[PDB]
Design an enzyme around this catalytic site. Sequence first.
Site, PDB file in Angstrom:
ATOM      1  N   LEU A  82       0.859  -1.180   0.000  1.00 48.86           N
ATOM      2  CA  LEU A  82       0.000   0.000   0.000  1.00 48.86           C
ATOM      3  C   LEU A  82       0.897   1.231   0.000  1.00 48.86           C
ATOM      4  O   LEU A  82       1.499   1.565   1.026  1.00 48.86           O
ATOM      5  CB  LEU A  82      -0.933  -0.007   1.210  1.00 48.86           C
ATOM      6  CG  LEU A  82      -1.938   1.140   1.338  1.00 48.86           C
ATOM      7  CD1 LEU A  82      -2.718   1.308   0.048  1.00 48.86           C
ATOM      8  CD2 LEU A  82      -2.885   0.892   2.502  1.00 48.86           C
ATOM      9  N   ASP A  83       0.989   1.900  -1.147  1.00 49.97           N
ATOM     10  CA  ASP A  83       1.916   3.011  -1.302  1.00 49.97           C
ATOM     11  C   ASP A  83       1.157   4.310  -1.549  1.00 49.97           C
ATOM     12  O   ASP A  83       0.806   5.018  -0.599  1.00 49.97           O
ATOM     13  CB  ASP A  83       2.898   2.715  -2.440  1.00 49.97           C
ATOM     14  CG  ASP A  83       3.947   3.794  -2.606  1.00 49.97           C
ATOM     15  OD1 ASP A  83       4.362   4.043  -3.757  1.00 49.97           O
ATOM     16  OD2 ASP A  83       4.362   4.389  -1.588  1.00 49.97           O
TER      17      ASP A  83
HETATM   18  O1  LIG Z   1       8.532  -0.875  -2.529  1.00 54.47           O
HETATM   19  C1  LIG Z   1       8.091  -1.342  -3.579  1.00 54.47           C
HETATM   20  N1  LIG Z   1       8.433  -2.625  -3.954  1.00 54.47           N
HETATM   21  C2  LIG Z   1       7.774  -3.241  -4.998  1.00 54.47           C
HETATM   22  N2  LIG Z   1       6.772  -2.573  -5.672  1.00 54.47           N
HETATM   23  C3  LIG Z   1       6.431  -1.313  -5.312  1.00 54.47           C
HETATM   24  C4  LIG Z   1       7.082  -0.677  -4.264  1.00 54.47           C
HETATM   25  N3  LIG Z   1       6.543   0.555  -4.128  1.00 54.47           N
HETATM   26  C5  LIG Z   1       5.576   0.713  -5.062  1.00 54.47           C
HETATM   27  N4  LIG Z   1       5.491  -0.441  -5.797  1.00 54.47           N
HETATM   28  C6  LIG Z   1       4.584  -0.712  -6.915  1.00 54.47           C
HETATM   29  O2  LIG Z   1       5.080  -0.056  -8.062  1.00 54.47           O
HETATM   30  C7  LIG Z   1       3.969   0.354  -8.905  1.00 54.47           C
HETATM   31  C8  LIG Z   1       4.106   1.819  -9.241  1.00 54.47           C
HETATM   32  O3  LIG Z   1       5.200   2.052 -10.124  1.00 54.47           O
HETATM   33  P1  LIG Z   1       5.008   2.893 -11.463  1.00 54.47           P
HETATM   34  O4  LIG Z   1       3.715   2.423 -12.086  1.00 54.47           O
HETATM   35  O5  LIG Z   1       6.281   2.733 -12.260  1.00 54.47           O
HETATM   36  O6  LIG Z   1       4.854   4.351 -11.100  1.00 54.47           O
HETATM   37  C9  LIG Z   1       2.693  -0.036  -8.155  1.00 54.47           C
HETATM   38  O7  LIG Z   1       2.244  -1.308  -8.621  1.00 54.47           O
HETATM   39  C10 LIG Z   1       3.176  -0.166  -6.713  1.00 54.47           C
HETATM   40  O8  LIG Z   1       2.392  -1.020  -5.907  1.00 54.47           O
END
Ligand SMILES: O=c1[nH]cnc2c1ncn2[C@@H]1O[C@H](COP(=O)(O)O)[C@@H](O)[C@H]1O
Lengths: 158, 158
Positions: A82-83
């Site tokens: 959950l971010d």
């Molecule tokens: O600490 C982490 N480890 C693995 N996945 C993450 C982490 N933090 C965020 N995410 C995932 O990375 C995605 C977001 O990355 P983006 O779409 O490149 O911006 C989402 O699916 C998040 O749940």
Amino acid sequence: TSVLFTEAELHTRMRGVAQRIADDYSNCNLKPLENPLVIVSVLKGSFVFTADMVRILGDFGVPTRVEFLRRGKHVLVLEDILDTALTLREVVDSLKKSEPASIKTLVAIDKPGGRKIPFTAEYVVADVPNVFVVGYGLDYDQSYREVRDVVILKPSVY
Amino acid sequence: TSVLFTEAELHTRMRGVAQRIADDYSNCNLKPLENPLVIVSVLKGSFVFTADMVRILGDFGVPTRVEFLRRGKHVLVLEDILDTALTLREVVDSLKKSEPASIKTLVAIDKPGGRKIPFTAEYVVADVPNVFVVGYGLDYDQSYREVRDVVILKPSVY
Ligand SMILES: O=c1[nH]cnc2c1ncn2[C@@H]1O[C@H](COP(=O)(O)O)[C@@H](O)[C@H]1O
Ligand SMILES: O=c1[nH]cnc2c1ncn2[C@@H]1O[C@H](COP(=O)(O)O)[C@@H](O)[C@H]1O
Ligand SMILES: [Mg+2]
Ligand SMILES: [Mg+2]
Ligand SMILES: [Mg+2]
Ligand SMILES: [Mg+2]
């Protein structure tokens, strides 16, 4: 780099959360088939956390039924991390449109420091600071999901 | 009704299968990101078996990457039960159209007595006679997947 939580630590916390879910859902009294706890797993990273959690909730008298993403029933949405809470907020609202009975959220790894919108999960296994972690379903480009522990990845890897 | 295989028996067999997969895929030498073993999990019942298997294959030097159903890479399709083999035969052929590198099948529960077409899995955790079982991902109308063991359901249940 370093290990934040091991599989033993996670399962111990998940047993404590399971006891809470067992007590909080007693007046619903869940039975298989007729009144199962509908588990909504958000693919992909949640599949490791969902597989362990359903085997623990059954150990605590809570029968479950699973659905995978990406009426009148009790729903518990499960996500690996959950971010920003943007995806879980949209999922919860989309599930409220079907009019359930009681909807809650259970996350394995909560990073409160990454919120883009205010959101609180009803059940949290562990908290993690705003650092990028892998393992226990979490990935960096579809890899390292199979690590039994939640660890921080080496910067030279990415 | 009765228990056919427990979680301990399954994990023991899955460790023996993992050692075979580790030896059979040595000349491919799998590394994370660059050359991961592509795991193709057939929803829903395979999610329990997939979550345990990827955590065991990593323990044996086999890094994996998971995809969920319902080029040039090595593919291992995982299904919870192998009965008529009609679904797995169609999935394997559909994955061969993308032209991988080496495709094999790994099933947790194989019921050879229910085949509608000839099909042999490269890796089988356990064999089960032609009886209806639940647990370890297997269901009867979306319930009893969370049972830690593969058991036969009471006839009065269904
Ligand atoms: O600490 C982490 N480890 C693995 N996945 C993450 C982490 N933090 C965020 N995410 C995932 O990375 C995605 C977001 O990355 P983006 O779409 O490149 O911006 C989402 O699916 C998040 O749940
Ligand atoms: O022994 C069993 N336990 C749980 N599921 C089974 C068993 N045998 C077959 N299945 C599944 O039942 C489905 C076939 O049922 P049908 O579609 O009603 O004909 C397929 O998804 C099979 O994999
Ligand atoms: Mg997520
Ligand atoms: Mg990701
Ligand atoms: Mg199947
Ligand atoms: Mg079924």
